Short mmCIF file of N, CA and C in Angstrom, two decimals:
data_model
loop_
_atom_site.label_atom_id
_atom_site.label_comp_id
_atom_site.label_asym_id
_atom_site.label_seq_id
_atom_site.Cartn_x
_atom_site.Cartn_y
_atom_site.Cartn_z
N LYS X 539 -45.88 61.68 -71.14
CA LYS X 539 -45.88 62.74 -70.34
C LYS X 539 -44.71 62.63 -69.32
N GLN X 540 -44.12 61.45 -69.14
CA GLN X 540 -43.19 61.07 -68.13
C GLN X 540 -41.76 61.30 -68.84
N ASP X 541 -41.48 62.59 -69.16
CA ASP X 541 -40.15 62.85 -69.65
C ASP X 541 -39.29 63.54 -68.58
N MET X 542 -38.07 63.86 -68.95
CA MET X 542 -37.01 64.21 -67.98
C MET X 542 -37.00 65.52 -67.34
N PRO X 543 -36.95 66.71 -68.06
CA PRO X 543 -36.15 67.84 -67.67
C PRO X 543 -36.56 68.49 -66.32
N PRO X 544 -35.75 68.45 -65.29
CA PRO X 544 -36.07 68.80 -63.90
C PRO X 544 -36.35 70.26 -63.79
N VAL X 545 -37.02 70.64 -62.83
CA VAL X 545 -37.32 72.08 -62.50
C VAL X 545 -36.17 72.80 -62.02
N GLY X 546 -35.51 72.24 -60.99
CA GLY X 546 -34.36 72.96 -60.48
C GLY X 546 -33.42 72.01 -59.83
N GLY X 547 -32.30 72.59 -59.26
CA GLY X 547 -31.29 71.89 -58.64
C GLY X 547 -30.10 71.81 -59.55
N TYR X 548 -29.13 72.65 -59.45
CA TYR X 548 -28.00 72.79 -60.37
C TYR X 548 -26.84 73.50 -59.56
N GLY X 549 -25.60 73.24 -60.09
CA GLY X 549 -24.44 73.82 -59.44
C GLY X 549 -24.02 75.07 -60.16
N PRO X 550 -23.09 74.89 -61.16
CA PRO X 550 -22.47 73.64 -61.51
C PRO X 550 -21.23 73.40 -60.67
N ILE X 551 -20.37 72.41 -61.24
CA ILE X 551 -19.04 72.34 -60.67
C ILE X 551 -18.19 73.38 -61.41
N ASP X 552 -16.96 73.67 -60.90
CA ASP X 552 -16.19 74.65 -61.54
C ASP X 552 -15.46 74.20 -62.82
N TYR X 553 -15.27 75.16 -63.60
CA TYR X 553 -14.15 74.94 -64.61
C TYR X 553 -12.81 75.55 -64.15
N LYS X 554 -12.82 75.94 -62.93
CA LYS X 554 -11.65 76.64 -62.32
C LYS X 554 -10.45 75.64 -62.12
N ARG X 555 -9.25 76.22 -62.07
CA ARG X 555 -8.01 75.54 -61.91
C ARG X 555 -7.09 76.23 -61.02
N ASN X 556 -7.04 75.85 -59.79
CA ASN X 556 -6.22 76.51 -58.74
C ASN X 556 -6.12 75.62 -57.59
N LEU X 557 -4.91 75.59 -57.02
CA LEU X 557 -4.61 74.91 -55.72
C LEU X 557 -3.37 75.51 -55.18
N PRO X 558 -3.21 76.81 -54.96
CA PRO X 558 -1.93 77.40 -54.54
C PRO X 558 -1.74 77.29 -53.04
N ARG X 559 -1.33 76.04 -52.63
CA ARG X 559 -1.10 75.78 -51.16
C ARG X 559 0.32 75.90 -50.79
N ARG X 560 0.80 77.07 -50.94
CA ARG X 560 2.22 77.41 -50.64
C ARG X 560 2.34 77.96 -49.18
N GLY X 561 3.25 77.40 -48.42
CA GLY X 561 4.20 76.41 -48.74
C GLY X 561 5.57 76.75 -48.31
N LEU X 562 5.68 77.88 -47.56
CA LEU X 562 6.88 78.42 -46.98
C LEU X 562 7.95 78.71 -48.12
N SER X 563 7.54 79.67 -48.87
CA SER X 563 8.45 80.06 -49.98
C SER X 563 9.21 81.37 -49.58
N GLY X 564 10.17 81.71 -50.45
CA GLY X 564 10.84 83.01 -50.40
C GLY X 564 11.64 83.35 -49.20
N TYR X 565 12.88 82.74 -49.12
CA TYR X 565 13.91 82.92 -48.14
C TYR X 565 13.58 82.26 -46.82
N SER X 566 12.30 81.86 -46.59
CA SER X 566 12.02 81.01 -45.48
C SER X 566 12.65 79.66 -45.68
N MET X 567 12.63 79.14 -46.87
CA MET X 567 13.55 78.07 -47.27
C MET X 567 14.95 78.66 -47.38
N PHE X 568 15.92 77.62 -47.39
CA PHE X 568 17.36 77.86 -47.16
C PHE X 568 17.68 78.23 -45.74
N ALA X 569 16.75 78.53 -44.91
CA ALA X 569 17.02 79.01 -43.60
C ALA X 569 16.90 77.84 -42.51
N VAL X 570 15.99 76.91 -42.81
CA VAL X 570 15.94 75.67 -42.03
C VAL X 570 17.09 74.69 -42.46
N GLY X 571 17.59 74.87 -43.67
CA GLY X 571 18.62 74.00 -44.15
C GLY X 571 19.97 74.29 -43.52
N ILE X 572 20.31 75.63 -43.50
CA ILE X 572 21.68 76.04 -43.07
C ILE X 572 21.79 75.80 -41.52
N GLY X 573 20.84 76.20 -40.67
CA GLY X 573 20.91 76.11 -39.28
C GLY X 573 20.97 74.66 -38.83
N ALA X 574 20.23 73.77 -39.33
CA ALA X 574 20.29 72.37 -39.00
C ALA X 574 21.50 71.70 -39.42
N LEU X 575 22.16 72.18 -40.58
CA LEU X 575 23.38 71.71 -41.05
C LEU X 575 24.46 71.98 -40.13
N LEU X 576 24.62 73.27 -39.61
CA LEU X 576 25.66 73.59 -38.65
C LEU X 576 25.33 73.01 -37.27
N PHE X 577 24.08 72.64 -36.99
CA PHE X 577 23.76 71.88 -35.80
C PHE X 577 24.35 70.56 -35.80
N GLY X 578 24.45 69.87 -36.97
CA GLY X 578 25.12 68.69 -37.03
C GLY X 578 26.61 68.83 -36.87
N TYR X 579 27.13 69.92 -37.42
CA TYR X 579 28.64 70.22 -37.08
C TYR X 579 28.78 70.64 -35.67
N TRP X 580 27.80 71.21 -35.03
CA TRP X 580 27.83 71.63 -33.66
C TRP X 580 27.80 70.35 -32.77
N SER X 581 27.21 69.32 -33.20
CA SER X 581 27.23 68.01 -32.60
C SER X 581 28.60 67.42 -32.66
N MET X 582 29.38 67.65 -33.73
CA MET X 582 30.86 67.42 -33.68
C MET X 582 31.54 68.30 -32.73
N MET X 583 32.81 67.92 -32.42
CA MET X 583 33.83 68.55 -31.58
C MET X 583 33.41 68.32 -30.12
N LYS X 584 32.21 67.79 -29.84
CA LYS X 584 31.93 67.28 -28.54
C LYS X 584 31.83 65.75 -28.46
N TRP X 585 32.05 65.08 -29.61
CA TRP X 585 32.14 63.64 -29.75
C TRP X 585 33.52 63.18 -30.27
N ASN X 586 33.89 63.82 -31.42
CA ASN X 586 35.27 63.39 -31.95
C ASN X 586 36.46 63.85 -30.99
N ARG X 587 36.30 65.06 -30.50
CA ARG X 587 37.28 65.49 -29.48
C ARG X 587 37.16 64.63 -28.23
N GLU X 588 35.96 64.26 -27.88
CA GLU X 588 35.66 63.39 -26.76
C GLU X 588 36.19 62.02 -27.07
N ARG X 589 36.14 61.50 -28.28
CA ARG X 589 36.71 60.23 -28.58
C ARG X 589 38.22 60.28 -28.77
N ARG X 590 38.67 61.42 -29.15
CA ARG X 590 40.11 61.70 -29.16
C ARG X 590 40.73 61.66 -27.84
N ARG X 591 39.97 62.11 -26.80
CA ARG X 591 40.42 61.96 -25.41
C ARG X 591 40.48 60.43 -24.98
N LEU X 592 39.56 59.71 -25.37
CA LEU X 592 39.53 58.26 -25.21
C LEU X 592 40.58 57.64 -26.05
N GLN X 593 40.99 58.27 -27.04
CA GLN X 593 42.00 57.59 -28.00
C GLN X 593 43.37 57.69 -27.38
N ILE X 594 43.73 58.69 -26.75
CA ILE X 594 44.90 58.80 -25.93
C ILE X 594 44.83 57.87 -24.74
N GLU X 595 43.74 57.71 -24.19
CA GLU X 595 43.43 56.86 -23.06
C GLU X 595 43.73 55.38 -23.50
N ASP X 596 43.26 55.04 -24.66
CA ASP X 596 43.46 53.70 -25.29
C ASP X 596 44.97 53.41 -25.53
N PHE X 597 45.66 54.43 -26.07
CA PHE X 597 47.13 54.32 -26.33
C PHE X 597 47.92 54.33 -25.06
N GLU X 598 47.32 54.91 -24.02
CA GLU X 598 48.04 55.03 -22.70
C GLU X 598 48.24 53.66 -22.06
N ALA X 599 47.38 52.74 -22.15
CA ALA X 599 47.55 51.44 -21.59
C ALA X 599 48.62 50.62 -22.41
N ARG X 600 48.85 50.84 -23.59
CA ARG X 600 49.89 50.26 -24.32
C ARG X 600 51.22 50.70 -23.94
N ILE X 601 51.41 51.99 -23.67
CA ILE X 601 52.77 52.52 -23.39
C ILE X 601 53.14 52.26 -21.92
N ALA X 602 52.16 52.22 -20.99
CA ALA X 602 52.44 52.05 -19.60
C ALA X 602 53.01 50.66 -19.28
N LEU X 603 52.48 49.65 -19.84
CA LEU X 603 53.16 48.27 -19.88
C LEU X 603 54.07 48.22 -21.12
N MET X 604 54.62 47.08 -21.43
CA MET X 604 55.73 46.87 -22.20
C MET X 604 56.99 47.62 -21.91
N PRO X 605 57.52 47.42 -20.63
CA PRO X 605 58.82 47.03 -20.41
C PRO X 605 58.74 45.62 -20.09
N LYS O 1257 -20.76 66.97 -61.36
CA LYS O 1257 -20.40 67.94 -60.19
C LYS O 1257 -19.24 67.36 -59.48
N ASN O 1258 -18.67 66.25 -59.82
CA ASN O 1258 -17.55 65.72 -58.99
C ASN O 1258 -16.46 65.26 -59.98
N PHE O 1259 -16.35 65.88 -61.21
CA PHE O 1259 -15.30 65.59 -62.07
C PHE O 1259 -14.18 66.46 -62.17
N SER O 1260 -14.36 67.78 -61.88
CA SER O 1260 -13.29 68.74 -61.93
C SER O 1260 -12.19 68.50 -60.83
N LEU O 1261 -12.52 67.81 -59.81
CA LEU O 1261 -11.51 67.38 -58.82
C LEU O 1261 -10.56 66.37 -59.49
N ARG O 1262 -11.14 65.52 -60.37
CA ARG O 1262 -10.31 64.43 -60.89
C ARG O 1262 -9.32 65.08 -62.00
N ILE O 1263 -9.76 66.08 -62.70
CA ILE O 1263 -8.88 66.78 -63.62
C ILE O 1263 -7.93 67.69 -62.90
N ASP O 1264 -8.17 68.06 -61.56
CA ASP O 1264 -7.24 68.83 -60.85
C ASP O 1264 -6.18 67.85 -60.22
N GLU O 1265 -6.42 66.51 -60.28
CA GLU O 1265 -5.41 65.48 -59.94
C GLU O 1265 -4.19 65.53 -60.92
N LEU O 1266 -4.52 65.31 -62.25
CA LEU O 1266 -3.55 65.15 -63.29
C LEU O 1266 -2.74 66.53 -63.47
N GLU O 1267 -3.42 67.64 -63.10
CA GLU O 1267 -2.72 68.88 -63.06
C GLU O 1267 -1.49 68.88 -62.07
N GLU O 1268 -1.75 68.33 -60.90
CA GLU O 1268 -0.62 68.08 -60.01
C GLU O 1268 0.28 66.96 -60.49
N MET O 1269 -0.28 66.02 -61.28
CA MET O 1269 0.59 64.91 -61.76
C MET O 1269 1.62 65.29 -62.86
N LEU O 1270 1.16 66.22 -63.78
CA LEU O 1270 1.96 66.42 -64.94
C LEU O 1270 2.39 67.81 -65.22
N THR O 1271 1.54 68.80 -64.90
CA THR O 1271 1.76 70.20 -65.43
C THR O 1271 2.93 70.86 -64.57
N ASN O 1272 2.77 70.86 -63.23
CA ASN O 1272 3.80 71.50 -62.38
C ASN O 1272 5.12 70.61 -62.30
N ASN O 1273 5.03 69.36 -62.76
CA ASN O 1273 6.27 68.58 -62.73
C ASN O 1273 7.16 68.97 -63.75
N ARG O 1274 8.47 68.83 -63.58
CA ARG O 1274 9.54 69.24 -64.42
C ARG O 1274 10.10 68.24 -65.39
N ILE O 1275 10.17 66.94 -64.95
CA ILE O 1275 10.69 65.88 -65.74
C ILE O 1275 9.80 65.58 -66.97
N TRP O 1276 8.46 65.57 -66.72
CA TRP O 1276 7.59 65.35 -67.91
C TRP O 1276 7.58 66.60 -68.76
N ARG O 1277 7.72 67.75 -68.14
CA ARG O 1277 7.95 69.07 -68.93
C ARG O 1277 9.24 68.87 -69.71
N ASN O 1278 10.32 68.39 -69.05
CA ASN O 1278 11.56 68.18 -69.67
C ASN O 1278 11.53 67.04 -70.68
N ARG O 1279 10.56 66.14 -70.42
CA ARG O 1279 10.41 65.05 -71.47
C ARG O 1279 9.77 65.51 -72.67
N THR O 1280 8.96 66.66 -72.65
CA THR O 1280 8.30 67.17 -73.80
C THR O 1280 8.33 68.72 -73.73
N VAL O 1281 9.35 69.34 -74.32
CA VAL O 1281 9.30 70.73 -74.77
C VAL O 1281 10.16 70.82 -76.03
N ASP O 1282 9.69 71.56 -76.97
CA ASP O 1282 10.44 71.82 -78.22
C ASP O 1282 10.53 70.54 -79.05
N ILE O 1283 9.60 69.68 -78.99
CA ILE O 1283 9.58 68.37 -79.63
C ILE O 1283 8.45 68.45 -80.62
N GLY O 1284 8.76 68.30 -81.92
CA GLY O 1284 7.71 68.31 -82.93
C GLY O 1284 7.34 69.75 -83.19
N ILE O 1285 8.34 70.61 -83.46
CA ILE O 1285 8.09 72.09 -83.68
C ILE O 1285 7.71 72.14 -85.21
N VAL O 1286 6.41 71.92 -85.45
CA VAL O 1286 5.88 72.19 -86.81
C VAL O 1286 4.92 73.23 -86.86
N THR O 1287 5.18 74.39 -87.33
CA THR O 1287 4.35 75.61 -87.26
C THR O 1287 4.16 76.39 -88.56
N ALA O 1288 4.78 76.07 -89.59
CA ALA O 1288 4.82 76.91 -90.84
C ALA O 1288 3.51 76.73 -91.58
N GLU O 1289 3.50 77.13 -92.75
CA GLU O 1289 2.29 77.02 -93.53
C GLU O 1289 2.27 75.62 -94.29
N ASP O 1290 3.32 74.81 -94.08
CA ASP O 1290 3.26 73.42 -94.42
C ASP O 1290 2.63 72.54 -93.25
N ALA O 1291 2.52 73.19 -92.12
CA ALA O 1291 1.66 72.57 -91.04
C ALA O 1291 0.18 72.71 -91.39
N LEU O 1292 -0.14 73.52 -92.44
CA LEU O 1292 -1.56 73.52 -92.93
C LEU O 1292 -1.58 72.98 -94.41
N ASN O 1293 -0.48 73.07 -95.22
CA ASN O 1293 -0.39 72.47 -96.51
C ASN O 1293 -0.50 70.93 -96.38
N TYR O 1294 0.02 70.43 -95.27
CA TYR O 1294 -0.21 68.91 -95.01
C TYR O 1294 -1.71 68.60 -94.71
N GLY O 1295 -2.53 69.59 -94.52
CA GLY O 1295 -3.92 69.20 -94.46
C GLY O 1295 -4.34 68.75 -93.08
N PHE O 1296 -3.75 69.19 -92.03
CA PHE O 1296 -4.03 68.84 -90.70
C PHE O 1296 -5.38 69.26 -90.28
N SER O 1297 -6.03 68.57 -89.38
CA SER O 1297 -7.23 69.06 -88.69
C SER O 1297 -6.84 69.59 -87.35
N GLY O 1298 -7.72 69.77 -86.51
CA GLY O 1298 -7.47 70.32 -85.12
C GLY O 1298 -6.58 69.45 -84.29
N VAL O 1299 -6.53 69.85 -83.02
CA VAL O 1299 -5.23 70.08 -82.23
C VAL O 1299 -4.00 69.28 -82.75
N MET O 1300 -2.91 69.90 -82.85
CA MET O 1300 -1.93 69.90 -83.99
C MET O 1300 -2.60 70.68 -85.17
N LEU O 1301 -3.24 71.65 -84.72
CA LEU O 1301 -3.63 72.98 -85.38
C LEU O 1301 -3.67 73.99 -84.22
N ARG O 1302 -4.69 74.81 -84.25
CA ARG O 1302 -4.95 76.06 -83.51
C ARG O 1302 -4.18 76.24 -82.21
N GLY O 1303 -4.11 75.20 -81.43
CA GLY O 1303 -3.15 75.25 -80.23
C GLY O 1303 -1.69 75.49 -80.70
N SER O 1304 -1.37 75.13 -82.04
CA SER O 1304 -0.22 75.64 -82.65
C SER O 1304 -0.71 76.67 -83.63
N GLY O 1305 -1.09 77.91 -83.18
CA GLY O 1305 -1.30 79.01 -83.96
C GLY O 1305 -2.72 79.27 -84.45
N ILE O 1306 -2.98 78.94 -85.70
CA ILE O 1306 -4.02 79.40 -86.65
C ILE O 1306 -5.38 79.12 -86.04
N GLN O 1307 -6.08 80.21 -85.52
CA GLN O 1307 -7.38 80.04 -84.96
C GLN O 1307 -8.37 79.68 -86.05
N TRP O 1308 -8.93 78.49 -85.93
CA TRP O 1308 -10.02 77.98 -86.81
C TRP O 1308 -10.52 76.68 -86.23
N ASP O 1309 -11.79 76.52 -86.25
CA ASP O 1309 -12.39 75.18 -85.81
C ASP O 1309 -13.85 75.12 -86.49
N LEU O 1310 -14.26 73.85 -86.49
CA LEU O 1310 -15.64 73.59 -86.97
C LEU O 1310 -16.70 73.55 -85.96
N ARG O 1311 -16.46 74.17 -84.80
CA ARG O 1311 -17.39 74.11 -83.65
C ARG O 1311 -18.19 75.40 -83.38
N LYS O 1312 -17.76 76.58 -83.97
CA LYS O 1312 -18.54 77.76 -83.94
C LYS O 1312 -18.41 78.51 -85.26
N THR O 1313 -17.86 78.00 -86.36
CA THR O 1313 -18.07 78.57 -87.59
C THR O 1313 -19.08 77.73 -88.41
N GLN O 1314 -19.37 76.56 -88.09
CA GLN O 1314 -20.29 75.70 -88.77
C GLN O 1314 -21.23 74.96 -87.77
N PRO O 1315 -22.47 75.14 -87.87
CA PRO O 1315 -23.41 74.63 -86.90
C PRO O 1315 -23.60 73.02 -87.21
N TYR O 1316 -24.21 72.42 -86.22
CA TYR O 1316 -24.65 71.02 -86.38
C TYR O 1316 -26.15 70.92 -86.13
N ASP O 1317 -26.52 71.25 -84.97
CA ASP O 1317 -27.85 71.20 -84.34
C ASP O 1317 -27.94 72.40 -83.42
N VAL O 1318 -28.68 72.33 -82.28
CA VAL O 1318 -28.66 73.32 -81.32
C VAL O 1318 -27.29 73.24 -80.65
N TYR O 1319 -26.29 73.86 -81.14
CA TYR O 1319 -24.98 73.82 -80.79
C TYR O 1319 -24.31 75.18 -80.59
N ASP O 1320 -24.87 76.21 -81.29
CA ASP O 1320 -24.33 77.57 -81.16
C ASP O 1320 -25.07 78.32 -79.95
N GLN O 1321 -26.19 77.74 -79.53
CA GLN O 1321 -26.91 78.40 -78.46
C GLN O 1321 -26.26 78.17 -77.05
N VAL O 1322 -25.08 77.62 -77.04
CA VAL O 1322 -24.33 77.43 -75.82
C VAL O 1322 -23.14 78.17 -75.85
N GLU O 1323 -22.48 78.50 -74.73
CA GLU O 1323 -21.36 79.33 -74.59
C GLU O 1323 -20.19 78.68 -74.01
N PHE O 1324 -19.03 78.88 -74.60
CA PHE O 1324 -17.73 78.20 -74.40
C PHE O 1324 -16.69 78.97 -75.10
N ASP O 1325 -15.46 78.57 -74.91
CA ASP O 1325 -14.31 79.13 -75.62
C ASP O 1325 -13.44 77.93 -76.04
N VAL O 1326 -12.49 78.29 -76.99
CA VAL O 1326 -11.64 77.23 -77.58
C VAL O 1326 -10.26 77.52 -77.26
N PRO O 1327 -9.41 76.59 -76.76
CA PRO O 1327 -8.12 76.82 -76.27
C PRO O 1327 -7.05 77.06 -77.45
N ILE O 1328 -6.13 77.96 -77.16
CA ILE O 1328 -4.95 78.20 -78.09
C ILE O 1328 -3.72 78.12 -77.16
N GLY O 1329 -2.70 77.27 -77.64
CA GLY O 1329 -1.42 77.18 -76.99
C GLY O 1329 -0.43 78.22 -77.52
N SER O 1330 0.75 78.26 -77.09
CA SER O 1330 1.63 79.35 -77.34
C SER O 1330 2.50 79.06 -78.62
N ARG O 1331 3.32 78.06 -78.53
CA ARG O 1331 4.27 77.80 -79.65
C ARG O 1331 3.83 76.49 -80.33
N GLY O 1332 4.57 76.00 -81.32
CA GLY O 1332 4.10 74.87 -82.13
C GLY O 1332 4.68 73.50 -81.78
N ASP O 1333 4.82 73.16 -80.52
CA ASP O 1333 5.40 71.89 -80.11
C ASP O 1333 4.26 70.98 -79.53
N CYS O 1334 4.61 69.88 -78.96
CA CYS O 1334 3.68 68.95 -78.42
C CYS O 1334 3.16 69.42 -77.08
N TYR O 1335 3.94 70.11 -76.29
CA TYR O 1335 3.55 70.56 -75.00
C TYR O 1335 2.59 71.82 -75.11
N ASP O 1336 2.57 72.56 -76.28
CA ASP O 1336 1.56 73.38 -76.55
C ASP O 1336 0.59 72.88 -77.55
N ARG O 1337 0.50 71.62 -77.71
CA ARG O 1337 -0.75 70.97 -78.14
C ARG O 1337 -1.25 70.01 -77.09
N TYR O 1338 -0.42 69.70 -76.08
CA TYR O 1338 -0.94 68.96 -74.85
C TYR O 1338 -1.93 69.90 -74.10
N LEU O 1339 -1.57 71.12 -73.89
CA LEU O 1339 -2.33 71.99 -73.02
C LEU O 1339 -3.66 72.48 -73.66
N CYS O 1340 -3.93 72.06 -74.83
CA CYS O 1340 -5.28 72.22 -75.36
C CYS O 1340 -6.21 71.24 -74.66
N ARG O 1341 -5.63 70.00 -74.40
CA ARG O 1341 -6.61 68.97 -73.88
C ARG O 1341 -7.00 69.07 -72.43
N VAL O 1342 -6.24 69.78 -71.68
CA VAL O 1342 -6.65 70.07 -70.28
C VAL O 1342 -7.76 71.13 -70.31
N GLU O 1343 -7.62 72.12 -71.09
CA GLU O 1343 -8.70 73.14 -71.15
C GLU O 1343 -9.87 72.59 -71.95
N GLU O 1344 -9.73 71.67 -72.87
CA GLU O 1344 -10.81 71.06 -73.59
C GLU O 1344 -11.73 70.31 -72.77
N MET O 1345 -11.27 69.58 -71.76
CA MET O 1345 -12.14 68.92 -70.87
C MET O 1345 -12.77 69.87 -69.85
N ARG O 1346 -12.09 71.01 -69.70
CA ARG O 1346 -12.73 72.10 -68.85
C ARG O 1346 -13.72 72.91 -69.69
N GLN O 1347 -14.00 72.44 -70.88
CA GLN O 1347 -15.17 73.08 -71.62
C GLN O 1347 -16.33 72.15 -71.64
N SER O 1348 -16.05 70.86 -71.72
CA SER O 1348 -17.23 69.91 -71.91
C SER O 1348 -18.00 69.81 -70.56
N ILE O 1349 -17.43 70.16 -69.53
CA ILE O 1349 -18.20 70.22 -68.27
C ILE O 1349 -19.10 71.42 -68.15
N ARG O 1350 -18.71 72.55 -68.79
CA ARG O 1350 -19.57 73.63 -68.85
C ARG O 1350 -20.76 73.41 -69.72
N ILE O 1351 -20.43 72.84 -70.92
CA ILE O 1351 -21.59 72.68 -71.85
C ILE O 1351 -22.62 71.65 -71.43
N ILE O 1352 -22.24 70.58 -70.69
CA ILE O 1352 -23.12 69.76 -70.08
C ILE O 1352 -23.93 70.40 -69.02
N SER O 1353 -23.31 71.20 -68.16
CA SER O 1353 -23.95 72.01 -67.14
C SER O 1353 -24.64 73.14 -67.81
N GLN O 1354 -24.58 73.37 -69.14
CA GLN O 1354 -25.45 74.38 -69.77
C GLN O 1354 -26.51 73.73 -70.64
N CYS O 1355 -26.32 72.44 -71.08
CA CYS O 1355 -27.28 71.74 -71.93
C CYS O 1355 -28.45 71.19 -71.09
N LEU O 1356 -28.26 70.93 -69.87
CA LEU O 1356 -29.29 70.28 -68.97
C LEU O 1356 -30.46 71.27 -68.64
N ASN O 1357 -30.08 72.51 -68.63
CA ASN O 1357 -31.07 73.56 -68.30
C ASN O 1357 -32.04 73.90 -69.44
N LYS O 1358 -31.79 73.43 -70.58
CA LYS O 1358 -32.50 73.93 -71.85
C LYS O 1358 -33.23 72.92 -72.55
N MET O 1359 -33.42 71.73 -72.01
CA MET O 1359 -34.19 70.67 -72.75
C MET O 1359 -35.68 70.82 -72.64
N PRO O 1360 -36.38 70.71 -73.76
CA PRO O 1360 -37.79 70.79 -73.58
C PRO O 1360 -38.41 69.33 -73.72
N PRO O 1361 -39.50 69.04 -73.11
CA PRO O 1361 -40.17 67.76 -73.39
C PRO O 1361 -40.71 67.75 -74.88
N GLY O 1362 -40.80 66.63 -75.42
CA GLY O 1362 -41.22 66.47 -76.80
C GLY O 1362 -41.28 65.03 -77.24
N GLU O 1363 -40.95 64.77 -78.54
CA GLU O 1363 -41.07 63.47 -79.32
C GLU O 1363 -39.65 63.02 -79.44
N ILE O 1364 -39.48 61.86 -80.18
CA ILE O 1364 -38.19 61.30 -80.36
C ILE O 1364 -37.94 61.39 -81.89
#
């Protein structure tokens, strides 16, 4: 008399197949790429030109002496 | 009840990936009537084309009294016999969740 089949309690689990967790698509990408890229170029011309100012300063001490 | 999450893992691991797709597309394109004159059985059959199986044209036991479908892929390569096996495991979960509701007590 002690056999298995239970009265209730069932799901089931799915046979489904989906995980569309997107994801900033469709022209939202290529937008964070370009602006941060020119931001790095914007970081230039305030350092290389600044080091160029120090570069003439470095060559200044050479020319002032040597007579 | 906790298995379809594990098959959703390998979907992220292989299906949407490109390199493994690039590793197997258009490889083993055998689709003609010599794909059946060679006497092949299932997958490397019906997933390449010809719909036929021994699972609902020929009974075994109480096996027709459950509901399911059989996968078919598009072309006749390995990647369209690979995608039988993802859907095939998505059928055995249904059948087990259908078989448990229908068992009577009895003898052995």
